[PDB]
Every structure is written in C-alpha cells, then in structure tokens.
Amino acid sequence: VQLVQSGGGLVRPGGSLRLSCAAAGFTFKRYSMNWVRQAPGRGLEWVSSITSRGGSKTYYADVVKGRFTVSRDNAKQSLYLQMNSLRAEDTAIYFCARSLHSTSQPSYMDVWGRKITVIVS
Amino acid sequence: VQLVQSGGGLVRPGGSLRLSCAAAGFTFKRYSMNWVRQAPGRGLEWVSSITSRGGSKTYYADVVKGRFTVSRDNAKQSLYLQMNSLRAEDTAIYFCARSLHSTSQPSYMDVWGRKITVIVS
Amino acid sequence: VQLVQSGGGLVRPGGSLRLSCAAAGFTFKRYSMNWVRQAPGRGLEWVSSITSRGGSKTYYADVVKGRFTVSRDNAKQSLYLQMNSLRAEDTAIYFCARSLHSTSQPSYMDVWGRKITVIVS
Amino acid sequence: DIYKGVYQFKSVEFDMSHLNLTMPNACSANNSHHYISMGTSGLELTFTNDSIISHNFCNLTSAFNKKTFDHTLMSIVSSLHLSIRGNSNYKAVSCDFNNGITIQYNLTFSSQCRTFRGRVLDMFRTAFGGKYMRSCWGWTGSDGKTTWCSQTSYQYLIIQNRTWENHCTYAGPFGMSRILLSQEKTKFLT
Amino acid sequence: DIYKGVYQFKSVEFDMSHLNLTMPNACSANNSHHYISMGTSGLELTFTNDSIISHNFCNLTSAFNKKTFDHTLMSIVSSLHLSIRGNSNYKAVSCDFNNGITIQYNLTFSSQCRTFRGRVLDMFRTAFGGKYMRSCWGWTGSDGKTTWCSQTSYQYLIIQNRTWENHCTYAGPFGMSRILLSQEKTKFLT
Amino acid sequence: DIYKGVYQFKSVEFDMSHLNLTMPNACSANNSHHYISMGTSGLELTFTNDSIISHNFCNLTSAFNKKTFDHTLMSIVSSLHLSIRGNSNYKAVSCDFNNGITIQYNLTFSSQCRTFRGRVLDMFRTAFGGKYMRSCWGWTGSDGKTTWCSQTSYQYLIIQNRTWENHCTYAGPFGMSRILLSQEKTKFLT
Amino acid sequence: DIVLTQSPGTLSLSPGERATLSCRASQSVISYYVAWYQHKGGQAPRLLIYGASSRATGVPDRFSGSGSGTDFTLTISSLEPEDFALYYCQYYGSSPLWAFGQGTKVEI
Amino acid sequence: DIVLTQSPGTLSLSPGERATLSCRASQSVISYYVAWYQHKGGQAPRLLIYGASSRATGVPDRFSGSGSGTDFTLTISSLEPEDFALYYCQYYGSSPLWAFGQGTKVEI
Amino acid sequence: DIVLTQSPGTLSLSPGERATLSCRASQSVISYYVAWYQHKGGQAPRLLIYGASSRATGVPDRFSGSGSGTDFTLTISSLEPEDFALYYCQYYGSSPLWAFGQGTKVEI
Amino acid sequence: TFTWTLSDNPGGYCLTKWMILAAELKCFGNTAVAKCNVNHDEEFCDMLRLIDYNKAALSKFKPDVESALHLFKTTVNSLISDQLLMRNHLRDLMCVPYCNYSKFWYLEHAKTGETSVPKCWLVTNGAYLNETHFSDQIEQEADNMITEMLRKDYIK
Amino acid sequence: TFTWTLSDNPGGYCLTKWMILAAELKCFGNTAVAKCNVNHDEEFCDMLRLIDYNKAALSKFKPDVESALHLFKTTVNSLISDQLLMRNHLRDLMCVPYCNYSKFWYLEHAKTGETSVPKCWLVTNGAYLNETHFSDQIEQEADNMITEMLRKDYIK
Amino acid sequence: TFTWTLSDNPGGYCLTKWMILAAELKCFGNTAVAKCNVNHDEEFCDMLRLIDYNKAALSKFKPDVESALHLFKTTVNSLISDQLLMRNHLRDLMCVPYCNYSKFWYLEHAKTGETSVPKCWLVTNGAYLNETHFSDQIEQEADNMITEMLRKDYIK
Numbered sequence A, B, C: 001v002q003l004v005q006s007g008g009g010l011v012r013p014g015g016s017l018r019l020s021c022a023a024a025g026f027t028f029k030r031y032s033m034n035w036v037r038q039a040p041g042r043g044l045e046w047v048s049s050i051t052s053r054g055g056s057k058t059y060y061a062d063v064v065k066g067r068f069t070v071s072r073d074n075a076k077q078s079l080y081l082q083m084n085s086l087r088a089e090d091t092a093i094y095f096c097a098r099s100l101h102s103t104s105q106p107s108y109m110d111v112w113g114r115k116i117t118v119i120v121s
Numbered sequence D, E, F: 001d002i003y004k005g006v007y008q009f010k011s012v013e014f015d016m017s018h019l020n021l022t023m024p025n026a027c028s029a030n031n032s033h034h035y036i037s038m039g040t041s042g043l044e045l046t047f048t049n050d051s052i053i054s055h056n057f058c059n060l061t062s063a064f065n066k067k068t069f070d071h072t073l074m075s076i077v078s079s080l081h082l083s084i085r086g087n088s089n090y091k092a093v094s095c096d097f098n099n100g101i102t103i104q105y106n107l108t109f110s111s112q113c114r115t116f117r118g119r120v121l122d123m124f125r126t127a128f129g130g131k132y133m134r135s136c137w138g139w140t141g142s143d144g145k146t147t148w149c150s151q152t153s154y155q156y157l158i159i160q161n162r163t164w165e166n167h168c169t170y171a172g173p174f175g176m177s178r179i180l181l182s183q184e185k186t187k188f189l190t
Numbered sequence G, H, I: 001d002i003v004l005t006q007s008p009g010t011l012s013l014s015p016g017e018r019a020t021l022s023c024r025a026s027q028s029v030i031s032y033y034v035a036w037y038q039h040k041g042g043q044a045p046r047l048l049i050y051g052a053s054s055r056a057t058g059v060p061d062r063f064s065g066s067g068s069g070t071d072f073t074l075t076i077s078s079l080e081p082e083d084f085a086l087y088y089c090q091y092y093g094s095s096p097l098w099a100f101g102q103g104t105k106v107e108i
Numbered sequence J, K, L: 001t002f003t004w005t006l007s008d009n010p011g012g013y014c015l016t017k018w019m020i021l022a023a024e025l026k027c028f029g030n031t032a033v034a035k036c037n038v039n040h041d042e043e044f045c046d047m048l049r050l051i052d053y054n055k056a057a058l059s060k061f062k063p064d065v066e067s068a069l070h071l072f073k074t075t076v077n078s079l080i081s082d083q084l085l086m087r088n089h090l091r092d093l094m095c096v097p098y099c100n101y102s103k104f105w106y107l108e109h110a111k112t113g114e115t116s117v118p119k120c121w122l123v124t125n126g127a128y129l130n131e132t133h134f135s136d137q138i139e140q141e142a143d144n145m146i147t148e149m150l151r152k153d154y155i156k
C-alpha cells in the first residue's frame, strides 16, 4: 500500500494548478479519498473528501467551499484537487489520505502520502 | 386501472367482426382476461377466457365453442375476440374483465370495460 | 449404457497403433475412464486411467509408464490409448471400463466394453 | 396439458404409508376418532362423550416399574401431555396403567378459550391441524370473527393403545414434528 | 440525496405499537424500570434498594388455584424465572400472589459474575438487551477488558403486574424471543 | 497439483485447541476413556468393569448447597444426564459429590437396545459420535443389519473431573452442540 | 355441470331494512372462489365480495358476504336508495369455467 | 505397494453348496472402496459387489460381499452351474491406482 | 459545529514517564469513530488508536487509547525519546466531516 | 452441482413404484434435485430428505420402533424445514389454501427431460385445487424456465 | 416470482399509515419482496413476516391475549430468523453497531420504481449511525443494482 | 458484496498462525467469504463463525469459563448450521464418509487469487480419503469456477 504525491509549486493569487495523489498498489475504487492540509504554525485541518466507487458525494470544508474541487478516476487510480482562485491563506502543505466508511470498519485515515508544498503570494 | 372497449356494430348472419378491449394503465401480461355478455332480458353469462403470459390455455363456453376465438397480445396490451358465423341468438352486450388466478389471491373479476353493443339479424 | 470397442490387431515390436473405445448412450464427460488388460495365463491388471471433464489428471501403471498415453475427447464421446514402443510382454487382451469417483457413491467399474486383441511378436 | 408448447403439466403424489417403520404418523378418521402410530404400535384418541375411567387417580410411580410397559407409546403420551397449554390439573386427568395405556381428560367446564377444554384442544390443534373441529372466518358474516381455540361439543377425551390396522390414510411425521416444538413451551413456574 | 444519478436514498422506520395485540413487548423505562407487556396486560421490573417483600416464602401450591389468576402474565413470569443460570435459591427469591403477581429477587452479595446477582442479570441481559447495566470494552484503557455479566449497584429486583399505559416506545417481540431460546438451557440436574 | 491449468489443489486444516476458552470440547482417546473439557476444567468418562461407588445414594439436595461446587462442570453433568433416553432409574445411578463430581451407571442387564445400557449408549453416541462402540453394516454379510444402539461389553461407566492437560486431540464444540438438541427430547410424563 | 341458484327471485323491501340473499350450488363448492357482483343498468358489473366473505375496494360496510361451504348468503346492513340493482353470485372452477346465477332483483 | 492376496487359489465344490472366498491386503484398507468382479471366459468382467457389502444391479441374492478392514470375504449362498468362473477383488487408491487380486477359481 | 479541545496544550516530561492526554468534544460523540494521530515533523501523520480503544498496525503496547462516551483520553505506558511529537484527536461525522483537535505537544 | 444422498437417475434422485401412489416410475433431472440439496424454502425437498433417510435406515438398521422414534425426535426432526412446517399450520388455521404434503405439481420438458422444482398442490375445505385454479401461477413457472434454460443455452 | 401472504401494490407488499412512524405510505416493488420469500439473512424480512402475521390475525381472529401469546411462543417464533436474532445480540454485548430492528434504509430508482432490499439502520451508544458513517456501504449497494438491472435489460 | 465480522485481507477474512494447524498463513478472497456470510449450507462457514466469535470474545471479555459456556448454549449454537450438524451425525452412524469439521480442501487460482468455498475433507474408518478418491468431484468444482469467472469476464 502506498499513496504517491504529485503536483505542487508556487503561484500568485488569481490562477491555480491542480494537485494529484495517484495511489497505486491496492484497489482504488474500494476506498474513499481525503485531502488534509496544515498551515504554517497551525494544526491539521480537513479540506475535502470524495466517496468510493462512483464518487457521487463530495464534501468540502466551509472555508474553502466553492473554489476547491475534489475528484477521482478509479479507471487509472488517481486522485485530484482542482484549485481555483488561490489565496495567501491557502499557503500550506497538503496531504492525501485513505479511508473506508462501513459497518465493519471504524472510521480512520490509514495510508497517507508525502507532503505537497503550495506557496501563494 | 382502466379497460378501454372497442369494436362493436351490427352485421347480418354469415359474416362477423372482432371485438377489442385494449386495456391500459397496468401490466397486461400478468393478468388473465375474460369475456362476458348479457342477452336482452337474460342474466350475465361467460363467453371466453384466456390465461396470461402467453395465452397457452383458452376456455370457451360450450354454447359458443367452435366459432368464437379469444386471443391476446401482451405486446400492444389488447384483448380480442374473433367472432365467426354469428347467430341471431348472439345479440347481446359484451364486457371485458380482468382476473388473476394464483394461491395468494381468490378468484374475482376486478376491472371491467364499458358496454359493447353487437346486433345481428 | 454401452461402451463400444475399436482398434486392435497385431504389429511387430517397435511399430504401434492406438486403441479406441467410443462409448455411446450416456454422458461421456461426467464419468472417468479406465484401461484394463489381461495377459494370457495371467489375471487382470490395470493399465491407465483418465479423469472426467477436462482430463487434467492421467494415471499410469509403472510397468507401462513412459510409452502408454491415455486421452479422451468428450466432444466425440470416445476414449483412446496411444500405446507406443511395443513389447512381446504387452501382448494381451485390453478392456475399457467406466467409473465415477465422488463422495456420493463407492468406487467401481460397472460398464465394460468387449475384448480388444493385441499381438506383438 | 402442454404449456408454451414444449412443457407438459404433471403431478406426483407421495404414498407415505411406507414411512411407517422409521418416522411416526398422526391421522384422523373422522370427527370423533384420531390415530397416532409408530410402526405397528398406535394410539386411540376418541372424543367420546361418555366416561370410561371413574376413579380419581393418576400415578406413574407404579407404571414405570412394571414388566408390561411400552416405551414407544409412553414416549408419545408424554409428548402430548406436556404440550397442553398451562398446567394440567390432576383433578381433571385420570390415569390407568393396569393393562395398556389409558388416560382420560375431563374437559367439562364445571370464557370459552380460557377453559381446560380450550387448552387441551390446543394440543389437538397442533398435532392434527385444523382439518376438523374448527369454524372458518367467513361463516357468520363478512365481519364475524372466530375464536383462537378449537371448540368441541363433546365432554371427554380418551387415549388408549391400538394395534395399527390402516385406520386412516397415512399423513406423515409432521403431526408430531409440530408437537415437539410445543412441548413445555408455555410451562408454568410450579 | 441521490446516488449514481438515477437512485435516491430513503429510509423506513417501523412503528411497533400496533403489534401489541398479537406479540409481546419488552422495554426499559429510564435505567431501572423495565416493562414486558402483552396487549394491555404488563409487568413492571424495578431495580431498587427498597425491599417490598419480607417474608421468606415463594409458594405456588395455592397460587394456581385461586379465584383470580392471570394466565398471560404468569406465562411471562415462568419464562423469565426459568432463564436464570443453575437453580434459583429459594433462600433468595420471595413471592406473593395474594393480589397480583409480585416476586422479589434478593441479589445481595452476602466473584463478580459467579454470584446470584450475575445469574439474574444474565436473564435481564437477554430479554432487555445490553443498553443498560453494562460497561463497554474500551473504557479503562485499550487493553482493559470488561466482565461477561452485566453488573448492578442496586440490591433488590421486583417484578409486579402493571396495566400498560404507554411507558415506552415499543421495541417488538424480540426480548421474549431471545428468552425462549435460553429457557432451561443450563438447568441443573436436581 | 494443477487442475484445468490455472487452478491448484490445496487443503486447510483447523487446529481447534485455541477454541478452548470460549466453547467446549468433547473427544475420545482410546475407546475406553472419553474427555469433555471447558477451558481447563474437564471430565473423565471411563468404561470399566471396576465399580467405584457401592452405596445406592444420589442426593443433590445437599451437594448444591456446599462451598465446593463447580458450576461449569455441573452444567455438563446435568446436560448429559438429561439426554438419556426415557427416565434414568436411581436404582442404577449412584452419586458422590464429597470430593468433586463422581457418578456411576451400572449398565448391567441383571432386548439389546431395550435395556438401560442401550439408553445410556445413546447419550454417548450423540456426544462422542460413532467412532467407537459401533459395528458397521457390512461386517456380517451383504444383507446383515446392525442395531441402532451402540453396544459395549463393559459394565460400569464412571464420570469424574479431570484437569485438562492435553489428554486428547481437540475436536470442537460439536459434541456438546448435539447434546443440546437431544436434551429432554424423550423425557417421560412422570 | 354446476348451476348457481339464487333465491328468492325478487326482493321488495322498504329503504333502511336488511335484505338477505341466497346462492345455492348443485355440487360442493370451495368458499374461497365465490364472488358477488352488483349490476345496475348502464353501469358495468361492480364487485362487492370475493372469497365469499371479503369486501372489495370502495365497498361500504353494509355489504357483507357470508355462508358455509354449501349455502351462500349476502346481507345488507341497511339498504339505501342507490343499492337497488341486480345481485349475482359467481363461482370459479368446475363446468363451465365461470358460473353465474340467474340474478336476484331488489326493489321498493 | 499394496497387494491383494486371494485364498484359497482354487475351489472345487459340488453344486448347491456355499463357497467362501477371501481377499487379503498388506495395507489398512477402507471397506468403502473394495469391489468384487466375476470374469468368465469371453464375457467381460461383471461387477458383483461394491463397497464390500453392496450388490450391484442385476446380481442375485446368492452373491454377498462382507468383511471388515484388512479381512474381506465373498460368499455364495448356493453355487449354480453358471457361476463357475474367476472371482477378483480390487481396491481403489494407494499404489497402483487400481489393485487386482491374483484370482480365485471355482470348479466342480 | 463540533470542536475537539485537547488539554493540556503541552507536556514536558522526562523519558520513561507516563503521560495522559485528553480530547473533549462539544457534543455527545459516538466513541466508534474517534482516532488519534501522531505527527512528527517530516513524517506524515501516523494513526495510533482507531475506534478510541484499538491500536493500529505496528503500534507498540505503549500507545493505548481509552475514554468514555464524552471524554477521550490517550495515555502512554512509558514515554520514550522516540515518541516526542504532536498528538491529535479526530472525530468523523457531524460538522465538519472530519474534526481535528488543536494538537498537543510532548517535549523533554 | 454436487448432489448428496444418504442412500446410493444418473446425477439425480429417482422414485420407486411402492413409493409413489399411482405411478410405476417418476423422477427428475440433475438440475432440479441439486436445489433441494442446497435450499430449504421448498416443501418438496423436505419429502426428499424424509424419503432418502427412510430408504437408508431400512437397509442398514434392523427394524426397531423405540430406537427409530428417538432418533427421529433428537436427530431426524432437523431435516424438516421449521419455517415451512409452521407456516402451513398458520395457513391451515386461517382457512386459506395450505399444503398437507401429499400432491406436488411440476413442469417437465417434452424432450430434454428438464424438470422444474415441484410445488405443492394446495388443499382447502378438504379438496384439492383444480389445475385451472392456479393457471396463471403455472404460467410463471413456464416463463421462469424459458429464461433459466436460455441462460445456459446461450452461454454454451 | 411467486408471492407469499397470510393476508391480501401489484406483486409485492405495501405498508399502511399505522405501520410506519412518519410517512403516509411507503412500499416496494415485486423484485425486493420476492427475496424475503427465499432469503432469511435480512432483518427487514422478519418485519415483513411479523407485519403480515399481525394483519391476518387481527382480521380473522377476535382479540385474545392468552391464546395469541401461546401461539407466538409455539408457532410464530419460526418466522423470526434465529441466527440473525442471536448475531445482533452478540454485536450488542461487544459494543459494536448493531440492529435494534426499528429503522431501515434502501435505494429507490428514480423512475422505474425498482427498490433494493432494505438494510437495517444500525445503532450504537443509543444513537443511530449517521447517514455519512456508512457512505461507502451505500455506494456499493448502488453499484450492485446497476449490474442487476443491466443484466435483465440487455437480455430483454 | 458486503462482508461483516464480529472482530476486525481487504474485503475478506484471513487466518492466523495459531488457528491454522500446519501453516503460517492461508486465507481467502472476498468472493468466497461473502458466501459464508449469506448461506448456511457449507460446513466450512460454520468454522469461520466459530473462529470469528472466539477472536472477538477473547479480546473484549476477560477470561471466564462459567459464563462463556452459558453464552455458548443459549446464544452461540445459532452460529452452527443445525441441519448440517445432524446430517453428518447420520452419515457417521451409517458408516459412510462423513466430516468432523477439521480438514477442508479448495482450489486457488494461480494468478487472480480467486478461491473456491472450501469443502470438507471426509473421513471414514478413521482415515482421510486421498485426493484421488474424489478426483471427479474436484474436476466438477474446477468447471464451476470457469463458468463463474467467465460470466464476469464477458460482461466486464
């Protein structure tokens, strides 16, 4: 099991680039994906989440709702995050996690990726 | 639920025309449908009855057995009666009914069409 | 039920030919086939055996291992024996039999073919 | 006849008079007489309307310790007695085991399904079904309801042994299959 | 909302107050009052430090033969009393059937699950579930384990008859269904 | 080896010694000594011609009310004694609970399956299978038949405790599971 | 063949009074397959009772099928001015497939 | 390997007399997989008993297999003129797959 | 919304000492969905105790979550120099979907 | 599909003359019999287990009634589906068509020998239901087997 | 698909106002109800049998509690799945989300009316599992029915 | 395919060293485990329910045999298929190959990891049968996989 990070960089407010966490080594469509970031000097915060299989339900944090877009493609095992209109407050390190929500398993994030850096100024 | 009548008219003995009760608003292929007539001054009498899901078994009253013909087409949801060699005794009003014969339900005619008039002289 | 024999004849050592027991009148692909021979002045001995369906497992007697080949084709309902590099000891009469090996019933050979003669000199 | 042109309607009826050696059987000849049998040993269940046993004694201390004692039949009687709803009153059950098995149920009232008669008929209902001795829903109007318990106009019910002589048409073991699940199911604390 | 576009998520919740006439019911009122009801007849199970019965008697020889006797409720009391592990100590169970059903379970210690309290609380656990009177696994550390039996701080357990007056949100007949599976499963040889 | 090319044959065997703490175990060693164990508490079942108890006394009025009393093991003994066909005669069952569980069955005739020995061997047959004490169908010809009851030449069957020290190979809880079905299935009216 | 005989032929009762009909069959009849129909002139026949004791949909409490396995009946709790029509009894099975009575008239 | 030893080698009994055969195996043998065959001249071998105690189809009551593990037999209730032939015993499993005995001959 | 409050904010304990953290939620929380994560600088967050009482894979005996349905504690059997990092408590459900605490730092 | 019997129709079970009421020989294909050896929702399958157990018991065990009854209560009773047995008792107490385990009806293919799972011929008022009383129910089974046979025929 | 009732929606059962807590009318298609005839692993089908029995008993038998209770202990218990009852009791004792039989959830097709077999809404800590706690469980159920209807749709 | 366990192989169950007799790790895929969580005809599934219950009982409850036995009698018997238990007892008394629930055999796909539902290894006369004794039965099981996997392969 392994989630592989991708994307990241530096961009001024007004334009943005998508992130990617193309996980491999396991059944991608059977797990729900998440996005977690941590602002410099701040603790962990939740960003987005998309459910397994079809990914019909996508949940966003109210802080970043309306300009972030979480999507996934079970065909080739890749997780995205299309950011639009970035802000200086969005500058942080972003993580991708794995979770499964059912009766058998309690809720937890199990297999994380590595940091993706995003600087906005 | 609704059974819609059709056909009808008058014809001299020797030639005849078919009747039609093209029911709509429910599942045609599940229900077995019958034909009931009533001679003027006489009570209700059974004429014909075809089963469902193919119409393999067709039963006729011995009074009219041999020249009548009951048939159904589950594709277009319509029930026919191909009368041949009509007789002056057959002048009556004809009805179409709906019934289902199984263990769960008792036997009863539930949804009827409206009067169809047949005149022969 | 009936197994019909085939093949047979006499050949000098070195030369060889296949046997055949094209059974008919029942389901070939379900039952496992066997080969039994009896040398003159000697009792019955087992020769080969091929299992049912795909015939994945074929068993041989160590005496004839390496030159006796047993195979079947459920499509044509026939059992063969590609027996090669013959020897004067191989001269005997050969039988084809029928058996099914499951938990439901014990093991036995119940339906047999008729004699097939082989002479090597 | 033939359905869809390539299938034909046919029926199989089981002659279950050959299951007599292994599994038991429970029959009912008519309203008054019913039969439970195992192999060749059987029981006689008569809804007779006159008494046979008059003494007020039911002791099984002596019955068990006798040379003559049928274990097959006394297993059946013990299964039926413990399927009676509530607790059976020995003021209303008389027993005699001098020669064979005979026990008498009094079933006289001395408000219809709460009596001793209604409880005994509950044991009868499970073993023999509702084929006899029941009134269906639609007899006294379209809104007339029937009692839970089966009702009898008779007074007594006698259980006696009877060698089997094909008194019925064999019904199978399902009569006592339901009895086994009724046994002591509603037993009181005592 | 809507899943896969062409399907939608919806729920059905059954109201089991209309099953009261045909099948029984089991409930707990707060944490200490519990009710088993059949139709309109019901029972009250109270966990109290207050003793109602003081005499040392649980006698049923005369209780069955009385002017009034509720057969529906005595069926439930008999079913519950027969789901207690081993043999009930008549030194610890008192009964009074003068006017209604009243049985007292003493449950005083005089080791946590091997006492008379642990056996009675096993009858409670099956009928009324594990919602109350239990401690879950992960409360005293990730390696701490909970006992097998449900434990109580109260001393006495009282069962009294009480006409049903909607003391609960109906739960269904499953409380009594689980009791009938455990009735006399561990009853001793005596 | 390999079937159809892309499948292979493999076997799984379960070691049932780890199910020792939660669910019971019943197994036989050598046709004379049989073991039923729960956790670390076990039972000795020996078929012997040697008599341990000579007195005709089996009272549990005082045995239950003692400081030394194993509830886990007495549950098994009560379950086993209640699976015996018919009613066990106290003329043939002796008891001793002074130094643990110790009960004796005479099994002496003093027709083969109608005796007390055949009834007791029915309890043994369910709990311990038919590995021992049975003769198969075809040993005495192709039309030779065998009795239903398992037969033994011994006289006495003794039950005593043992502390489990791997007397046997674990077989699982299925032996005690079959006893639960047969418990009091054929009790008498008494 | 089976014949369904309905007696009496004609009913003349004042409004607000019970009216009891009867249907008789020559042979023994399963009560599960016995239905009653109300036929009122221009209107098509209207099912009242099926299974000999079960009221259909939209059938008031007044109509009440009954009867044992031999003698069938049909009663009206309190007949109203709009329930004057021809009442038929029906049976499925036997010969012919559908059996109808001669008809009982209820009048003022 | 497994070897099946049939004793005695030959039998000479008058018609209408019992004839008990034997089949000994060096191994411990499951009685479920032991079958007996009768081979007579030009006729192909005919199955008599399978499972060591079960008569095949069309086998008279005279033939009766028996025997526990490691000690198998075969008895004829009353041998007739047409049951003079070679009687074999086999086992399935072990090495080889099918093991046949040396054959016991019954004559007059 | 739901807020997870972690107290005390920081811990200063010597190696080999026993530590007890605490997580508090505003609402009443289903204990089945409470997880603890250890975050150590470069390393991504490491799951420790999912289900509020069950250790994850490759988690030593030292880490052991606990707590009733309202208070969610985490304790360390004997803290070692290798386990100085930030400890988070997490809840799933309610608003927002994933709730994280403010973090607790353990330092020498 | 693997088929088991306590005793010993290739691939299926067959019924004997002294075993059916008024027929010399009737029995069923492999496809239908396997369902009874895996399912317990059909009442016909409870007949097969009782039939199969009785045949084996007679051949191997010498006759005895007190020992055969005890094995029936303790052991053999578990071969009867409890839900089916105690549902038909409810249908009998409500005076609606129920099954007393005597007559079973089934459809058999004209040529291939394909056979459905027999369904009980229900009784009420002490009389069997005519074939026309449940004619539409029979028409369900005919179309069920069209799809079932077309499923296996197309897949080849 | 044959249907089963102890009493009187075309092809399936339907739920009345006084047997649903907070809805005027809710019920299901033919396909889902037919499964409860054969299947016994769903807690929802135990509701259907208990609802069906209660409707029949109230209409045909006059009210009485002593005789209705005794028929429940003897006869009606067989209508409740025995394995499900004891499984959910074990899930209760271990404090894991169990089913207390009250609320069930299912998916309904937007147009065709096809409906899944309702699954129990589990409870723990005296609170129902919240709608998003088993979100991935709903997703596989939606994908399960996609194949189930597509298989029937393609073959026509 | 939803899978449930009382305790905590993605989508299926896996067997530990101390519960397997003579191996370190043998365990099975999602497809086979689901059948044991829906059906009760296979004797292997009664083992998984016993293994699963034992693992959960040990972790969450402190050791006690007086109370573990009682919960076994009242509650855990429902986890054992009663019909199978009485059948094997009948096969044991008649001296035919039966099962004491110990050894099971299955087929594992070489590449995909697909695994059949294990079937019991049968014992008679105090000896296990060789693989050659039921060789034709194995050939039949291998064809069940081919149709079952090709059904999913075509539809994609």
Ligand SMILES: *[C@@H]1O[C@H](CO)[C@@H](O[C@@H]2O[C@H](CO)[C@@H](O[C@@H]3O[C@H](CO)[C@@H](O)[C@H](O)[C@@H]3O)[C@H](O)[C@H]2NC(C)=O)[C@H](O)[C@H]1NC(C)=O
Binding pocket: F017, F018, F019, F020, F021, F166, L018, L058
């Ligand atoms: C009765 O069954 C119990 C539990 O099924 C057996 O005790 C358990 O045995 C295993 C293996 O022997 C123990 O695992 C061991 O754990 C320690 C660390 O805890 C480790 O050093 C070993 O390598 C091994 O993994 C286990 O702790 C122990 N107890 C429990 C509660 O699981 C016992 O052996 C059985 N007794 C008999 C007589 O069969």
Ligand SMILES: *[C@@H]1O[C@H](CO)[C@@H](O[C@@H]2O[C@H](CO)[C@@H](O)[C@H](O)[C@H]2NC(C)=O)[C@H](O)[C@H]1NC(C)=O
Binding pocket: D068, D098, D099, D100, D101, D161, D162, D163
């Ligand atoms: C019920 O059983 C009893 C006892 O088995 C039968 O009474 C015996 O009948 C035999 C006939 O063979 C007499 O010789 C005995 O004297 C009778 N008494 C006893 C104590 O054995 C009785 O016949 C059976 N009842 C019926 C109706 O057959």
Ligand SMILES: *[C@@H]1O[C@H](CO)[C@@H](O[C@@H]2O[C@H](CO)[C@@H](O)[C@H](O)[C@H]2NC(C)=O)[C@H](O)[C@H]1NC(C)=O
Binding pocket: D051, D052, D053, D054, D106, D108, D109, D110
């Ligand atoms: C069956 O029971 C009835 C009613 O209990 C008994 O007849 C009564 O006997 C008592 C005894 O004192 C009298 O007080 C009653 O007057 C009797 N008659 C009635 C109608 O109650 C009858 O004796 C019992 N049968 C037998 C055979 O003992």
Ligand SMILES: *[C@@H]1O[C@H](CO)[C@@H](O[C@@H]2O[C@H](CO)[C@@H](O)[C@H](O)[C@H]2NC(C)=O)[C@H](O)[C@H]1NC(C)=O
Binding pocket: E029, E030, E031, E032, E033, E167
């Ligand atoms: C126990 O739960 C029940 C809910 O039915 C309640 O008990 C009632 O409490 C009120 C107010 O104190 C009293 O007027 C009633 O008399 C009580 N009922 C009975 C039957 O005595 C209450 O919620 C809880 N009682 C406690 C915790 O003592």
Ligand SMILES: *[C@@H]1O[C@H](CO)[C@@H](O[C@@H]2O[C@H](CO)[C@@H](O)[C@H](O)[C@H]2NC(C)=O)[C@H](O)[C@H]1NC(C)=O
Binding pocket: E051, E053, E054, E106, E107, E108, E109, E110
């Ligand atoms: C419940 O049991 C307790 C303890 O067994 C009883 O209280 C004891 O009664 C005995 C009777 O001789 C005294 O010796 C003890 O001193 C009492 N107290 C204790 C703490 O043991 C109590 O009586 C029982 N309940 C009732 C209602 O009688």
Ligand SMILES: *[C@@H]1O[C@H](CO)[C@@H](O[C@@H]2O[C@H](CO)[C@@H](O)[C@H](O)[C@H]2NC(C)=O)[C@H](O)[C@H]1NC(C)=O
Binding pocket: E048, E049, E153, E154, E155
């Ligand atoms: C009934 O009495 C018991 C003890 O006699 C009480 O249980 C005590 O509860 C307190 C809670 O404040 C604990 O600190 C004690 O340790 C408990 N006692 C024992 C002996 O453990 C119980 O609370 C009482 N209940 C009522 C309503 O009075």
Ligand SMILES: *[C@@H]1O[C@H](CO)[C@@H](O[C@@H]2O[C@H](CO)[C@@H](O)[C@H](O)[C@H]2NC(C)=O)[C@H](O)[C@H]1NC(C)=O
Binding pocket: E068, E098, E099, E100, E101, E161, E162, E163
């Ligand atoms: C428990 O039942 C008893 C007896 O059925 C009830 O006590 C009777 O109550 C009525 C009230 O209508 C009084 O007239 C009677 O005198 C009482 N005694 C008897 C012997 O009938 C009692 O009320 C019930 N318990 C509750 C809580 O309602």
Ligand SMILES: *[C@@H]1O[C@H](CO)[C@@H](O[C@@H]2O[C@H](CO)[C@@H](O)[C@H](O)[C@H]2NC(C)=O)[C@H](O)[C@H]1NC(C)=O
Binding pocket: F068, F098, F099, F100, F101, F161, F162, F163
């Ligand atoms: C059978 O059970 C009895 C009762 O526990 C055991 O007898 C006791 O054994 C212990 C050994 O620790 C002695 O100290 C006691 O004195 C014995 N008697 C009593 C009354 O406790 C007996 O040992 C058990 N059998 C075996 C073989 O261990």
Ligand SMILES: *[C@@H]1O[C@H](CO)[C@@H](O[C@@H]2O[C@H](CO)[C@@H](O)[C@H](O)[C@H]2NC(C)=O)[C@H](O)[C@H]1NC(C)=O
Binding pocket: F051, F053, F054, F091, F092, F106, F108, F109, F110
């Ligand atoms: C156990 O063995 C027998 C079984 O009946 C009984 O004692 C025998 O009694 C008979 C007749 O009274 C005598 O012939 C025997 O000699 C007695 N002893 C034995 C060993 O068989 C009695 O039930 C029991 N006896 C003992 C000593 O335990």
Ligand SMILES: *[C@@H]1O[C@H](CO)[C@@H](O[C@@H]2O[C@H](CO)[C@@H](O)[C@H](O)[C@H]2NC(C)=O)[C@H](O)[C@H]1NC(C)=O
Binding pocket: F048, F049, F153, F154, F155
């Ligand atoms: C226990 O005693 C019985 C009989 O008292 C013995 O059974 C005998 O076993 C021999 C074996 O050679 C048989 O020949 C006898 O026929 C059997 N006796 C009877 C009466 O049938 C048994 O072997 C004894 N066991 C021990 C260990 O002494």
Ligand SMILES: *[C@@H]1O[C@H](CO)[C@@H](O)[C@H](O)[C@H]1NC(C)=O
Binding pocket: E016, E169, E170, E171, E172, K100, K101, K102, K123, K126, K127, K128
């Ligand atoms: C199930 O538990 C919930 C949570 O408290 C409760 O509201 C509901 O009434 C319970 N259902 C039943 C049938 O008891």
Ligand SMILES: *[C@@H]1O[C@H](CO)[C@@H](O)[C@H](O)[C@H]1NC(C)=O
Binding pocket: F169, F170, F171, F172, L099, L100, L101, L102, L123, L124, L125, L126, L127, L128
């Ligand atoms: C099953 O029986 C055989 C017979 O020898 C034995 O080897 C095996 O161990 C038995 N299994 C168990 C669990 O007792």
